[PDB]
Coordinates of C-alpha atoms in Angstrom, one line a residue:
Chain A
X1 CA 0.0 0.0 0.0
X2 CA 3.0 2.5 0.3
X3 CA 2.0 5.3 -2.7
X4 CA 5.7 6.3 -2.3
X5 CA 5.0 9.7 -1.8
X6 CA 3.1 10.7 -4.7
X7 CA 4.0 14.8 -5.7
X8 CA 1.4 17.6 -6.7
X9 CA 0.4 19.0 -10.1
X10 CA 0.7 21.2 -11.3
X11 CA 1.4 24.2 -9.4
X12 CA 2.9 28.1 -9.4
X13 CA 6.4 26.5 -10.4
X14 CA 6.5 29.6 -13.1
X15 CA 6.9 32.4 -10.1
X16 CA 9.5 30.9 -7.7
X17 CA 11.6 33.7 -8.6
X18 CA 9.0 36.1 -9.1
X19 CA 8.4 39.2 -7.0
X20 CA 8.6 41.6 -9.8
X21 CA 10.7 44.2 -9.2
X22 CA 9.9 48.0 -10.1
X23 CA 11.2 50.6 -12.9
X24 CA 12.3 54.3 -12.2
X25 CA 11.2 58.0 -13.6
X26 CA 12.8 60.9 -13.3
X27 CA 11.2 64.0 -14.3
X28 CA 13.3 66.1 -14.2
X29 CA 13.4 69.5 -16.9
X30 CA 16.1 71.4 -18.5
X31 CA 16.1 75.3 -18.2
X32 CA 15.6 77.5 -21.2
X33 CA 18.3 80.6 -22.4
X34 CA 16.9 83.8 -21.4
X35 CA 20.0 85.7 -22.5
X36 CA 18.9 87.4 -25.5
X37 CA 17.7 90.6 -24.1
X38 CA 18.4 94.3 -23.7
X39 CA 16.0 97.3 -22.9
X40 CA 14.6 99.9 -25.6
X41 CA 12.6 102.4 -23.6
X42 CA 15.4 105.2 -22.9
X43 CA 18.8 106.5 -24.5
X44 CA 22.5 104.8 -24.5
X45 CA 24.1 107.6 -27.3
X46 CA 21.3 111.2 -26.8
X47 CA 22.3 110.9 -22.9
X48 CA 26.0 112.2 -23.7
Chain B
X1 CA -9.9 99.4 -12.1
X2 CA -6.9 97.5 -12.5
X3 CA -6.1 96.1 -9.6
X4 CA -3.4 97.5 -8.2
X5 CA -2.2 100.2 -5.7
X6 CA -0.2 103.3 -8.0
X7 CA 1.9 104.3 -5.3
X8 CA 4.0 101.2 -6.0
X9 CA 5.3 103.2 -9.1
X10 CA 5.1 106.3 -11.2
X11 CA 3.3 107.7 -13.9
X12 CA 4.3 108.2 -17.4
X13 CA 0.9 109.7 -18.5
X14 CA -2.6 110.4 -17.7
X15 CA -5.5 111.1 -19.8
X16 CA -9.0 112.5 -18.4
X17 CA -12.1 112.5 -20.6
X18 CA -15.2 114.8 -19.4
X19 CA -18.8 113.8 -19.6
X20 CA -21.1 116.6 -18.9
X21 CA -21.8 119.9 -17.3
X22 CA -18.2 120.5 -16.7
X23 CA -16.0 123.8 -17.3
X24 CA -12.7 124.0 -18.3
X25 CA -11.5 126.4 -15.5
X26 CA -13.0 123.9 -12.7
X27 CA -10.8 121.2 -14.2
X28 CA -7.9 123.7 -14.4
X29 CA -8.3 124.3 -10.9
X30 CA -9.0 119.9 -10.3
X31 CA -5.6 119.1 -12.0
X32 CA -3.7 121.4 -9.5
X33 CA -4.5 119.0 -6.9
X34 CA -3.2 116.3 -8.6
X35 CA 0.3 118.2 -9.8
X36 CA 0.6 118.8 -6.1
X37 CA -0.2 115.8 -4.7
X38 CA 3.5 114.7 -5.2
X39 CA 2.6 111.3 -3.9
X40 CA 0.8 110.6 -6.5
X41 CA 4.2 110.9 -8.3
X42 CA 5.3 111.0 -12.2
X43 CA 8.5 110.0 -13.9
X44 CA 11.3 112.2 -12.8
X45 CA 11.6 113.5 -16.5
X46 CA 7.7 114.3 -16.9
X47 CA 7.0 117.4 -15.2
X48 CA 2.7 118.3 -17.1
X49 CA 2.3 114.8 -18.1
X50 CA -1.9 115.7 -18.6
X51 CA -4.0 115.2 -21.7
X52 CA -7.8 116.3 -21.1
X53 CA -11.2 116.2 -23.4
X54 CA -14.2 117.9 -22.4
X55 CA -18.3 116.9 -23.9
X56 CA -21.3 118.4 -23.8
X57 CA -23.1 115.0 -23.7
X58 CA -23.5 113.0 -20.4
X59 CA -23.8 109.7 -19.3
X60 CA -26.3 107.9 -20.2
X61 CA -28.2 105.5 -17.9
X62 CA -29.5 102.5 -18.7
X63 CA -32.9 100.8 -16.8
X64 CA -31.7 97.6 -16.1
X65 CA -29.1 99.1 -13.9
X66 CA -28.4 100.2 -10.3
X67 CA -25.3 102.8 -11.3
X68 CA -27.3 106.5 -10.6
X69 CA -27.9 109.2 -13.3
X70 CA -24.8 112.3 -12.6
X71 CA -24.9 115.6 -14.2
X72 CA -21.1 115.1 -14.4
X73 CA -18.5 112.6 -14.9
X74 CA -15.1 111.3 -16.1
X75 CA -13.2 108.5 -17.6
X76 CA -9.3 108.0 -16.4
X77 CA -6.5 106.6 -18.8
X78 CA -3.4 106.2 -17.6
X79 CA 0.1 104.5 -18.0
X80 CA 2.3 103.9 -14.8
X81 CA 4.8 101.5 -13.6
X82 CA 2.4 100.4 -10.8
X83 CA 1.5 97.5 -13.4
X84 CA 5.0 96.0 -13.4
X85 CA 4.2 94.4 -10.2
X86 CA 2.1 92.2 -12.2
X87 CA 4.2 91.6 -15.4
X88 CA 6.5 90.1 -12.2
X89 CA 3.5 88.0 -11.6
X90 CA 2.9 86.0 -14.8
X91 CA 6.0 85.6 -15.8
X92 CA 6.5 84.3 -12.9
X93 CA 3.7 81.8 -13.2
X94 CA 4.6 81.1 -16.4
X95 CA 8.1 79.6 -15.1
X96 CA 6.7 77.7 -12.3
X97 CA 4.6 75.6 -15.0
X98 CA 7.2 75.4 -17.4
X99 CA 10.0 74.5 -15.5
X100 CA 7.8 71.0 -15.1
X101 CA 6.5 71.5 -19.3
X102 CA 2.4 71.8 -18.3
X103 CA 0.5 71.2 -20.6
X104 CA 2.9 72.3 -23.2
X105 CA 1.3 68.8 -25.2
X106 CA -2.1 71.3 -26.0
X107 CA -0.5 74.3 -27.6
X108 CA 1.8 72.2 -29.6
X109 CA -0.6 69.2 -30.8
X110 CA -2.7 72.4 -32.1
X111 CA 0.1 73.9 -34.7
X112 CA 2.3 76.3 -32.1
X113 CA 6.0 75.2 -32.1
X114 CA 7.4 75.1 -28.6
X115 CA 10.0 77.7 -29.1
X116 CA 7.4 80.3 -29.2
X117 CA 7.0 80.1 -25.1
X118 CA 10.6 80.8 -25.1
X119 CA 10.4 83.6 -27.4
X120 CA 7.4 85.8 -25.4
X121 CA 8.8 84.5 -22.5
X122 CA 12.0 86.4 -23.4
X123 CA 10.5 89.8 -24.9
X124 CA 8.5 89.4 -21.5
X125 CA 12.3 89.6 -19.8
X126 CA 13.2 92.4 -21.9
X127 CA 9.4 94.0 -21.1
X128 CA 10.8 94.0 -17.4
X129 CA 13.7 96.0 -18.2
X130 CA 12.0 98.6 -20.5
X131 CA 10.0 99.1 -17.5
X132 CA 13.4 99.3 -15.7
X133 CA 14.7 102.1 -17.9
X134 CA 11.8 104.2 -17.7
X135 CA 11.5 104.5 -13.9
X136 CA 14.9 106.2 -13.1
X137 CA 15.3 109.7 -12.2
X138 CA 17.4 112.2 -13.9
X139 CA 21.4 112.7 -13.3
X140 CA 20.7 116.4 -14.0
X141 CA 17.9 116.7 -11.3
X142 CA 18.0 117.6 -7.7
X143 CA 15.4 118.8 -5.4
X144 CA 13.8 120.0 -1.9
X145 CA 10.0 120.3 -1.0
X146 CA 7.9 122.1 1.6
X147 CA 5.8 119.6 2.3
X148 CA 6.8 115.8 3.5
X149 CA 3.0 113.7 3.0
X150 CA 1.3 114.4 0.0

């Protein structure tokens, strides 16, 4: 009568490893050039 | 009716438009007031900065409304730097949402290029320094006053 310990089928073998794991963002901008200027509204050469 | 407070600048020009039973020598005398009033102050280099219109015709009143019916009254334009408090407040807004690109996707999915935000964003910048260059005072100008609260 001894079944010699007969095993299961068939199970979650596939995610013995599984957790999963997460991914990363990182958001994150780059400024933009505001250099381009000078003033109009008064005098630089009429002043002298 | 802009909301602001014109002491926190100066005035380049005003312009006052009459409505009414109004006479040119009791708005000669209403403009000294406000020539003396020194706190209410002008750019250093504008010195009669008025323009005035007078009209026969009144205001009108409508029914529907609650505003009363005046024998005289008067319409205010003016240009000051008391606005450049709030050219300092968009473009300041303006950075805070595009420093994280919001909603950037809508104007640009709808035929703007992107470089166009950078671009008024930028005569903005120069706006704030034309408004810069007009509120100084003159090298050539000194000064002393009677009276210290206008």
């Amino acid at each position: 009568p001894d079944l010699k310990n007969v095993k299961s089928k068939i199970g979650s073998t596939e995610n013995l490893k599984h957790q999963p794991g997460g991914g990363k963002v990182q958001i994150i901008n780059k400024k933009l050039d505001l250099s381009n200027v000078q003033s109009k509204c008064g005098s630089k050469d009429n002043i002298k | 009716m802009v909301k602001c407070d014109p002491r926190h600048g100066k005035y380049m020009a005003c312009c006052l438009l009459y409505r009414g039973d109004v006479v040119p020598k009791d708005v000669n005398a209403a403009i000294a007031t406000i020539k003396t009033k020194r706190s209410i102050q002008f750019v250093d280099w504008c010195p009669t900065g008025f323009k005035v219109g007078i009209n026969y015709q009144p205001p009108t009143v409508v029914p529907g409304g609650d505003l009363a019916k005046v024998q005289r009254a008067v319409c205010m334009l003016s240009n000051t730097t008391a606005i450049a408090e709030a050219w300092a407040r968009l473009d300041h807004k303006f950075d805070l949402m595009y420093a994280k690109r919001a909603f950037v996707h809508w104007y640009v999915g709808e035929g703007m290029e992107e470089g166009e935000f950078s671009e008024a964003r930028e005569d903005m910048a120069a706006l704030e320094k034309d408004y810069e260059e007009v509120g100084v005072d003159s090298v050539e100008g000194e000064g002393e006053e009677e009276g210290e609260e206008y």
